[PDB]
Amino acid sequence: CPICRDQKLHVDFRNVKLLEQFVCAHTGIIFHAPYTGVCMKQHKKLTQAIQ
Amino acid sequence: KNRAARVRVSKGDKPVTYEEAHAPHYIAHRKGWLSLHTGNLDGEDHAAERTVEDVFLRKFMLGTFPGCLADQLVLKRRANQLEICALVLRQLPPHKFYFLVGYSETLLSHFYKCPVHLHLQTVPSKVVYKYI
Amino acid sequence: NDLRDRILSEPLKHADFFNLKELFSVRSLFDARVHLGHKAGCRHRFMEPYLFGSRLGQDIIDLEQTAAHLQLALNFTAHVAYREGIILFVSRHRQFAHLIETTARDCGEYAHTRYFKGGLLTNAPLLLGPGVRLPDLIIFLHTLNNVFEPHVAVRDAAKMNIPTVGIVDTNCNPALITYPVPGNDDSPPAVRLFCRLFQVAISRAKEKRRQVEALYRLQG
Amino acid sequence: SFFTKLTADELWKGALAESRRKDLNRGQIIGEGRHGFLWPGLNIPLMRNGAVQTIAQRSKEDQEKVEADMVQQREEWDRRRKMKVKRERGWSGNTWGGVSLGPPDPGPNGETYDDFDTRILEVRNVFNMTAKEGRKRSVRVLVAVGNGKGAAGFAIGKATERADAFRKAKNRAVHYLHYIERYEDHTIYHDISLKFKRTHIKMKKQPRGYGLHCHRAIMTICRLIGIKDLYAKVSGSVNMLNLTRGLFLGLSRQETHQQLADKKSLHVVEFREECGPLPIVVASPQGALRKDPEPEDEVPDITLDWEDVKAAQGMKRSVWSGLKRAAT
Amino acid sequence: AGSRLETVGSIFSRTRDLIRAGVLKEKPLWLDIYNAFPPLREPVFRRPRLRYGKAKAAVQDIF
Ligand SMILES: [Mg+2]
Ligand SMILES: [Mg+2]
Ligand SMILES: [Zn+2]
């Protein structure tokens, strides 16, 4: 994935600069995995993160 | 369709030496002879020897001087000495050129048991008669 | 740099700058026969507005419109000449061939009156030379080829972003021509008239150019 | 048997058989040999600290090493020939559609485009009947170009060798450019329904978060134009050429807010939904603004596409429609 | 390059707009002169359609 091919990336609630690019700027809703291409695990972790 | 010693028409980009651009029927009309010796004149002997000899010096010069040979090699026989002219491309550093000059002259002279004279005319790039 | 911008932009502020108003009249065009078209049979469909009306089968252009148009055409021609650019007259019409070259040679302008090789403007660098400048303005004294189709040069100029000033006739198609002048191409008084007029507009533009250059040189 | 042997080139002609080539001219220096002699002018520089080195022979092991070196050289070259397979895929695999062809060629006038991207829309093998040859095989590629800034175009090109044809279409395509007017620099201005030669194009103007929903070709073209938000469905025959011609005619068919304003002499006013009732002005009629209101019919007469109205009422049930797809 | 399409619109259109997209880096002469004094109608391309049915011309005969 984008997220896990690079291990130095950390999915948290803290980094807004990472979580920003997984949310639609105008619509303020997250992308489903296929839009992005992340794996299901990292996508669930990303939703829970943005929350 | 005569295939003899000919070079086919390409897409038109193919570089061609003046010699390789002039087909067999052209000898003695435009093109000249690559070798010269007495042997084929009316009253003359040992033509065959100068032919074997010539052939071997074609192969020899192609092999002693790798990748640096420009156009086909011009042999002359004069009063028992060979005068071998070559068009040679500039690849080698000159030291190596003279190494091979001495090497060739000596080796051949002792092979054909007659004194050999060598001449290198150096050229920047293969002369292009046609296309390109 | 500044003063060159001045020299080019100055003439645009004055609608008359070359003073061509006096170079013709509606009477003038009337005696140059411009008001005659072809039979109503041979009329094109896009002349229907420029026409005045049918007199016994022969169609008649509107000379008021002729003047309004021709004014703008000549103005244009001039402003290009002044700006030092190529002008190419074109006609295939035989009667007038000589005129149009004889005109153009005297303007320091170029004519092409001949067979027109096909890729001429479109494929310039292959036909004319390794790199070349193309006509800044093309000017048709007839819009046709002797086979009565539109001259290639129309499609081609228009294809190349060259402006075009030409005389449409009742049969001709105006629509690709930048600045039309509706009018009679066929009668020799008419050809001669249009010739000498474009001639003069050119000459005046060139003179005025020279002058303003001399003034530029005194100011410096 | 030295007499029987030949030149290399001849051997490669009669090996290859065109009625891959490795070269033996690579790796061997002058005087290089297996019996391992160091010749004063070739293997070794002519002089050392002392002058005029003599004719010398390396060890057994020094030679085993130089031979190992040539062997590892050949291995290196074979690996370098095998590593030569790498690519970026255009649409699918061996489809050349959407493949980047690389910026067009600088023209005669020094004009240079580093800004123009090119994409291959359709590569196709085309045949002919030649009395001489039997079939004759040409390649024709339809290619588009654009800078992202709104001007773009396309051309066809055709040649025997496909490489040649990629080239040809590039250069010819810079010659036909359209300016494509974009609203707020992403969408189109208003909806376009356009029938062109057995192909119908229909495209809806989207808001910003909605990236490029289109036929794969039209996506490609819209990335080259710089249109970032679009809905486009295509009906009838899908053939590439008619499609790009159609699309380009249609996006040049566009009526701009300024032009609407000008012909109607009225103000044009965008009502956003997110911004509520706020009556944003987009365009004003340079010249005289009319004092005349315009007729409001209870009943407008418009062509209505059954597909849009079917959409409107929840009657599009196709399982393919609402799919999640990858990013634009 | 430019735009060779003879149908698309007037030369004015194409040229102005191609400059607008900054493809054409040199404003051409006739362009500025044109802006100054435009012609009556834009030189736009029209198919010369034939007339069918009941459609006649608008010409008024002269008497
Ligand atoms: Mg025979
Ligand atoms: Mg595959
Ligand atoms: Zn993952």
Side-chain angles (χ1 to χ4, degrees):
Chain A
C1 321
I3 275 189
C4 347
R5 81 190 147 171
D6 180 18
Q7 200 56 27
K8 293 190 160 189
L9 242 359
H10 291 72
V11 165
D12 301 304
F13 70 104
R14 292 194 182 184
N15 34 358
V16 174
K17 302 174 186 176
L18 179 61
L19 290 220
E20 188 80 347
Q21 52 198 329
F22 286 91
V23 180
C24 195
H26 322 280
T27 326
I29 55 173
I30 325 153
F31 313 119
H32 50 285
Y35 190 94
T36 284
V38 279
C39 57
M40 290 305 129
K41 212 173 91 197
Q42 298 283 354
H43 172 88
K44 190 184 267 192
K45 255 163 203 167
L46 271 202
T47 299
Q48 291 173 348
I50 299 163
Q51 268 317 308
Chain B
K1 235 193 306 188
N2 320 247
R3 309 243 120 229
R6 244 159 271 230
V7 168
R8 292 300 133 171
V9 242
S10 319
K11 219 61 172 183
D13 70 338
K14 180 187 183 176
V16 190
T17 293
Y18 178 89
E19 239 233 15
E20 311 167 313
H22 271 159
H25 44 277
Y26 280 138
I27 291 160
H29 291 234
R30 332 182 156 190
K31 202 166 152 189
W33 280 284
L34 269 185
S35 172
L36 264 331
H37 61 267
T38 292
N40 301 145
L41 294 149
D42 177 89
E44 308 311 325
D45 260 339
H46 319 291
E49 312 313 322
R50 314 305 171 240
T51 307
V52 190
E53 183 177 333
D54 193 312
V55 169
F56 168 76
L57 301 188
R58 304 298 171 136
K59 272 258 206 168
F60 181 90
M61 280 292 119
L62 204 63
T64 291
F65 285 70
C68 69
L69 220 14
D71 305 337
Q72 308 218 345
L73 169 88
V74 177
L75 305 201
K76 309 193 176 189
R77 241 163 249 78
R78 200 203 306 254
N80 118 277
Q81 76 207 3
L82 321 182
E83 312 179 14
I84 294 182
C85 316
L87 228 66
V88 180
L89 207 78
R90 17 190 143 218
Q91 305 247 311
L92 264 48
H95 321 124
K96 308 179 177 182
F97 266 137
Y98 276 83
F99 183 111
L100 294 178
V101 167
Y103 163 73
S104 303
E105 280 168 19
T106 315
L107 202 72
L108 297 184
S109 290
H110 296 235
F111 196 89
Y112 281 140
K113 322 291 265 187
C114 61
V116 184
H117 222 233
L118 192 67
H119 303 100
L120 266 66
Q121 192 197 312
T122 289
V123 174
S125 302
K126 259 191 180 185
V127 197
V128 191
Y129 181 48
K130 215 172 297 167
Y131 311 91
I132 279 218
Chain C
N1 298 332
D2 303 314
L3 326 132
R4 312 196 156 192
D5 297 336
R6 295 178 182 178
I7 213 181
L8 289 208
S9 179
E10 175 160 4
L12 310 182
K13 301 152 188 181
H14 326 257
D16 302 323
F17 188 92
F18 307 82
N19 197 5
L20 313 147
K21 260 299 179 175
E22 55 176 10
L23 288 192
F24 61 97
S25 143
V26 195
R27 181 96 211 156
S28 184
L29 303 185
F30 193 94
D31 310 325
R33 315 239 197 98
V34 181
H35 67 299
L36 306 146
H38 289 83
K39 282 310 183 188
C42 308
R43 100 202 261 163
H44 200 278
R45 195 206 171 154
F46 274 90
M47 298 285 92
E48 301 182 2
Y50 294 63
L51 266 178
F52 185 54
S54 245
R55 174 87 191 161
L56 285 188
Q58 188 189 16
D59 290 358
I60 287 154
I61 337 273
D62 194 321
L63 275 201
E64 304 198 345
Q65 287 186 42
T66 313
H69 292 65
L70 176 57
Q71 174 224 21
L72 241 196
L74 288 190
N75 167 35
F76 192 84
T77 315
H79 271 265
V80 159
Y82 168 101
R83 290 186 93 133
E84 309 271 27
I86 306 95
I87 286 212
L88 193 62
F89 300 87
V90 268
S91 161
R92 296 289 298 112
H93 207 128
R94 316 191 91 209
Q95 277 218 48
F96 319 112
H98 218 42
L99 254 214
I100 304 145
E101 300 129 2
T102 309
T103 275
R105 115 170 298 163
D106 295 340
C107 294
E109 287 309 346
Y110 320 74
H112 178 115
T113 300
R114 267 337 141 190
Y115 186 65
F116 197 78
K117 289 206 241 182
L120 203 39
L121 318 193
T122 341
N123 198 161
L126 197 38
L127 222 326
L128 293 188
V132 170
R133 196 156 145 239
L134 269 194
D136 251 317
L137 163 54
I138 299 237
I139 297 176
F140 296 76
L141 297 214
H142 306 70
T143 323
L144 294 199
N145 56 9
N146 298 307
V147 207
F148 296 63
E149 293 122 5
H151 193 307
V152 226
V154 165
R155 242 191 58 245
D156 274 27
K159 181 153 236 192
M160 221 74 47
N161 312 337
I162 301 173
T164 285
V165 169
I167 297 161
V168 312
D169 189 338
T170 304
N171 72 334
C172 299
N173 171 47
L176 255 207
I177 306 150
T178 320
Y179 303 77
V181 29
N184 170 35
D185 68 347
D186 300 287
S187 165
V191 160
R192 290 179 199 148
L193 196 82
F194 279 91
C195 256
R196 85 145 183 251
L197 277 210
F198 280 100
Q199 162 97 35
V200 166
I202 292 306
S203 307
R204 281 193 188 187
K206 301 202 161 185
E207 292 325 291
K208 203 76 156 189
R209 170 59 151 205
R210 283 188 180 183
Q211 277 183 20
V212 186
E213 285 294 338
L215 170 72
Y216 176 102
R217 294 172 180 188
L218 289 195
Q219 290 175 332
Chain D
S1 177
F2 147 82
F3 272 153
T4 335
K5 305 175 165 190
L6 285 181
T7 312
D9 315 325
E10 316 174 359
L11 284 151
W12 274 126
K13 221 186 230 147
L16 260 183
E18 343 117 319
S19 40
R20 202 170 173 179
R21 178 173 213 171
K22 190 171 184 183
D23 297 307
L24 310 172
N25 198 5
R26 181 176 254 174
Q28 291 188 12
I29 336 183
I30 351 282
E32 182 82 3
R34 116 175 182 191
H35 284 334
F37 279 90
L38 303 125
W39 304 104
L42 305 189
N43 296 272
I44 44 194
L46 266 174
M47 278 181 44
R48 206 172 182 169
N49 46 337
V52 199
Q53 322 158 354
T54 331
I55 285 72
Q57 182 173 15
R58 293 170 202 162
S59 67
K60 251 223 191 177
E61 179 52 42
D62 211 333
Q63 230 41 243
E64 304 309 292
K65 267 193 176 181
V66 185
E67 294 164 21
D69 299 338
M70 188 165 51
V71 163
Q72 300 324 301
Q73 281 305 316
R74 304 285 163 173
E75 307 313 316
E76 170 190 20
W77 292 119
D78 294 332
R79 306 153 165 191
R80 277 189 178 178
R81 182 187 297 187
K82 300 314 174 178
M83 274 196 59
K84 256 188 184 180
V85 190
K86 277 152 189 180
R87 196 168 178 174
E88 169 234 15
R89 97 192 147 213
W91 273 339
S92 58
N94 310 306
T95 294
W96 290 69
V99 178
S100 64
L101 197 54
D105 302 333
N109 292 308
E111 51 196 32
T112 288
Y113 332 95
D114 222 333
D115 312 338
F116 276 109
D117 312 327
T118 165
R119 294 299 173 142
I120 296 137
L121 295 186
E122 190 197 40
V123 45
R124 216 212 213 100
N125 256 326
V126 142
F127 285 107
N128 197 27
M129 212 50 50
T130 284
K132 232 51 228 154
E133 195 195 9
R135 302 198 189 178
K136 170 194 283 186
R137 188 266 216 99
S138 289
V139 182
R140 71 97 159 281
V141 281
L142 159 72
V143 146
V145 275
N147 59 14
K149 297 179 176 184
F154 65 96
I156 271 197
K158 175 167 44 190
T160 302
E161 302 285 16
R162 92 160 154 240
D164 207 332
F166 290 113
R167 167 181 77 121
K168 292 188 146 169
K170 260 199 301 188
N171 304 326
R172 254 197 59 169
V174 192
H175 276 175
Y176 310 98
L177 293 168
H178 306 62
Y179 188 67
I180 303 302
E181 267 150 354
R182 310 169 297 135
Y183 168 86
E184 197 67 20
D185 304 282
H186 41 252
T187 347
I188 59 170
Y189 263 51
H190 57 293
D191 250 70
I192 289 152
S193 95
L194 175 88
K195 172 167 192 167
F196 181 70
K197 277 175 135 196
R198 286 310 110 202
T199 287
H200 320 103
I201 227 347
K202 200 163 91 198
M203 36 198 10
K204 289 174 194 169
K205 168 190 171 163
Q206 297 299 293
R208 280 216 203 182
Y210 185 112
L212 260 214
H213 211 61
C214 289
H215 180 81
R216 53 188 191 187
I218 300 199
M219 288 178 80
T220 285
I221 265 189
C222 272
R223 280 192 210 85
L224 289 207
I225 278 175
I227 292 168
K228 310 195 185 180
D229 323 309
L230 185 34
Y231 179 77
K233 172 75 192 312
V234 16
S235 316
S237 207
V238 223
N239 84 282
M240 211 50 64
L241 184 67
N242 259 15
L243 189 48
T244 109
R245 285 183 72 225
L247 183 62
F248 260 64
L249 156 67
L251 293 186
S252 209
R253 276 275 177 239
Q254 260 181 325
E255 173 189 11
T256 280
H257 287 150
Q258 212 49 226
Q259 316 178 345
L260 179 57
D262 287 328
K263 78 176 191 184
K264 306 252 201 173
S265 329
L266 294 142
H267 274 100
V268 354
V269 189
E270 163 193 36
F271 292 108
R272 217 94 178 82
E273 197 85 318
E274 53 157 11
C275 289
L278 178 75
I280 314 157
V281 166
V282 175
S284 93
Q286 42 167 46
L289 165 66
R290 269 168 50 196
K291 294 207 149 197
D292 202 338
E294 273 204 0
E296 290 197 353
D297 280 337
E298 294 188 353
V299 182
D301 198 323
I302 324 154
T303 292
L304 315 177
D305 305 316
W306 169 238
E307 312 289 3
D308 274 22
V309 195
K310 204 203 260 163
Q313 303 150 13
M315 305 289 97
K316 277 291 161 207
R317 290 172 312 173
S318 110
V319 293
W320 302 108
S321 171
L323 287 191
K324 307 174 233 162
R325 295 160 169 286
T328 281
Chain E
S3 295
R4 303 189 125 165
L5 315 136
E6 330 162 325
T7 305
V8 163
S10 53
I11 21 170
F12 177 49
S13 65
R14 235 167 316 147
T15 313
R16 127 190 287 186
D17 272 346
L18 198 75
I19 256 186
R20 187 193 172 181
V23 167
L24 200 62
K25 293 180 178 176
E26 273 292 338
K27 185 164 184 182
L29 311 130
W30 74 274
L31 175 60
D32 210 333
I33 298 165
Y34 185 93
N35 279 319
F37 317 104
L40 315 178
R41 183 186 130 261
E42 298 295 346
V44 222
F45 175 85
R46 292 203 210 180
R47 289 274 130 200
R49 308 288 181 175
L50 184 51
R51 280 184 192 271
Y52 288 94
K54 285 200 209 311
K56 311 161 191 177
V59 98
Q60 177 192 19
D61 56 339
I62 288 181
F63 286 109

